[PDB]
Design a protein around this motif. Sequence first.
Motif, PDB file in Angstrom:
ATOM      1  N   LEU A  93       0.826  -1.208   0.000  1.00  0.00           N
ATOM      2  CA  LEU A  93       0.000   0.000   0.000  1.00  0.00           C
ATOM      3  C   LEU A  93       0.858   1.254   0.000  1.00  0.00           C
ATOM      4  O   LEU A  93       0.387   2.322  -0.415  1.00  0.00           O
ATOM      5  N   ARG A  98       2.335   3.018  -4.016  1.00  0.00           N
ATOM      6  CA  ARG A  98       2.229   4.454  -4.275  1.00  0.00           C
ATOM      7  C   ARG A  98       3.546   5.004  -4.806  1.00  0.00           C
ATOM      8  O   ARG A  98       3.551   5.829  -5.728  1.00  0.00           O
ATOM      9  N   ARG A 128      -2.173   8.903  -8.038  1.00  0.00           N
ATOM     10  CA  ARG A 128      -3.315   8.104  -7.606  1.00  0.00           C
ATOM     11  C   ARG A 128      -4.592   8.941  -7.619  1.00  0.00           C
ATOM     12  O   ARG A 128      -4.677   9.965  -6.930  1.00  0.00           O
ATOM     13  N   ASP A 153      -8.612   4.567  -4.929  1.00  0.00           N
ATOM     14  CA  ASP A 153      -8.143   3.456  -4.107  1.00  0.00           C
ATOM     15  C   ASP A 153      -9.310   2.464  -4.090  1.00  0.00           C
ATOM     16  O   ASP A 153     -10.323   2.714  -3.431  1.00  0.00           O
ATOM     17  N   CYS A 202     -10.872  -1.028  -3.118  1.00  0.00           N
ATOM     18  CA  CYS A 202     -10.692  -2.095  -2.143  1.00  0.00           C
ATOM     19  C   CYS A 202     -11.489  -3.328  -2.533  1.00  0.00           C
ATOM     20  O   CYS A 202     -12.698  -3.243  -2.778  1.00  0.00           O
ATOM     21  N   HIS A 239      -6.022  -3.978  -2.021  1.00  0.00           N
ATOM     22  CA  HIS A 239      -6.221  -2.701  -2.691  1.00  0.00           C
ATOM     23  C   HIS A 239      -5.689  -2.755  -4.119  1.00  0.00           C
ATOM     24  O   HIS A 239      -4.596  -3.271  -4.371  1.00  0.00           O
ATOM     25  N   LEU A 249      -4.783   0.100  -6.750  1.00  0.00           N
ATOM     26  CA  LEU A 249      -4.610   1.542  -6.877  1.00  0.00           C
ATOM     27  C   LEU A 249      -4.744   1.978  -8.333  1.00  0.00           C
ATOM     28  O   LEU A 249      -4.150   1.379  -9.237  1.00  0.00           O
ATOM     29  N   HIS A 253     -10.912   5.792   4.991  1.00  0.00           N
ATOM     30  CA  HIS A 253      -9.644   5.127   5.250  1.00  0.00           C
ATOM     31  C   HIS A 253      -9.053   5.631   6.552  1.00  0.00           C
ATOM     32  O   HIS A 253      -9.144   6.826   6.855  1.00  0.00           O
TER      33      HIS A 253
END
Lengths: 242, 201
Positions: A103, A107, A117, A120, A122, A149, A151, B107
């Motif tokens: 994660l 990035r 990005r 996100d 999930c 995740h 991205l 988040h």
Amino acid sequence: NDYCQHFVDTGHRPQNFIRDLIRLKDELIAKSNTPPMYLQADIEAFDIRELTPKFDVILLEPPLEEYYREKCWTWDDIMKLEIDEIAAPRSFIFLWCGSGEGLDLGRVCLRKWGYRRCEDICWIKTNKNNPGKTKTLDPKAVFQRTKEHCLMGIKGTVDIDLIITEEPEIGNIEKPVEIFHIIEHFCLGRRRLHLFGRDSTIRPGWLTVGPTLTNSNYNAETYASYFSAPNSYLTGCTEEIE
Amino acid sequence: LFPPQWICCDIRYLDVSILGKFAVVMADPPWDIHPYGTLTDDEMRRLNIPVLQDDGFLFLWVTGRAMELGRECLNLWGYERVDEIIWVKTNQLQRIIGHWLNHGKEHCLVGVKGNPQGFNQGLDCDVIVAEVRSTSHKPDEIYGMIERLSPGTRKIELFGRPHNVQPNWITLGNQLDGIHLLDPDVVARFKQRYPDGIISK
Ligand SMILES: O=C(NC[C@]1(O)CCCN(c2cc(NCc3ccccc3)ncn2)C1)c1ccc(CN2CC3(CCC3)C2)cc1
């Protein structure tokens, strides 16, 4: 009703209790789709630049170690991929990052390759069928990890950011096919590359490149012929030009 | 001192060294994304989070570009991000409620500092499912996960509102009702550092 407490009481993940037309667009996508093309290649040892033309969408699914609880790629290997060498100036990437250090290192990759990005996504895994299966935690983990995740990255100038399916059986590394629907519904262009795809992920509208493919039919000039004029700029969500 | 405590204040200016050390820190910052009581990126970075813990966990709510900026602050303050909670936002019937996709979740980065010992790691999972209450109101389930993770320890929340005060927690925010401190060590250090009850620079 506190579903976190319930998870502690019973082992049923809180996401077990989540409940739940213009599909003409789907049909436009299917009519727009190029024939499926695919190429066996060891991406470690492979000059990525042979993949032409530049891509509008790149789906990147390196086989992380964490996918094999019971060759894996490290983020060291992934970060060194020359992804920016094959992306179109305006293009999108979808990077499966797992649920650990990916994660953060994912990035870094996106920035390394020149993207930012924008989403996100999930993938939340239910355990409706095995509430009595405890998870062996990563040493650093504070919590049981029940999601992955993907991205989304943009470079250059209907759907929600959640996928909910049941947790696949041990040893099944496949990601939910719903990611493809999300991607295709963005109508981002028709040059779509899936790196580290498999025989089982080959799909119309997509060029699949991976080391475990058993067959190949990729020809760069054949592939480029699908996007030569007058079809250079189609979104993938419009009618074919007569 | 176990019952809820709080300090109405400008978290930029409070001298948080008077508060002692905490097993858990939670922050829900007013990030400068796409202003009200907003903090700039440099103000966030400069928050003296480092004095607040020696060994323990930080919980940091993030959205939009604070997903990345929150990872910066987290690392600058000396934490490693070891987990990421997501709260799936539903209605009362358990149905789910960034210009490319609609957002079904919020988040919360989880960072570790030092070597936390005696925490109940792995009791909960990293997905919360809970009903939206009001705007920018986090779900109360997070306090339960934190209590099971670290039962009975001292905790501190940054940028909380009055609905956020909880036993074992000290809540800071500029919309609380005055000061309310009961822990003697904190009360002493507060009188010494603030003999007139004012928090200025
Ligand atoms: O409402 C919030 N927090 C209370 C405040 O009270 C508001 C006013 C400001 N705030 C200061 C600011 C401060 N100093 C700076 C300053 C002071 C005066 C004038 C200008 C700047 N010091 C002390 N508290 C904090 C808030 C903000 C964002 C989110 C986002 N979440 C939604 C989410 C929750 C979980 C899902 C994530 C939720 C709640």
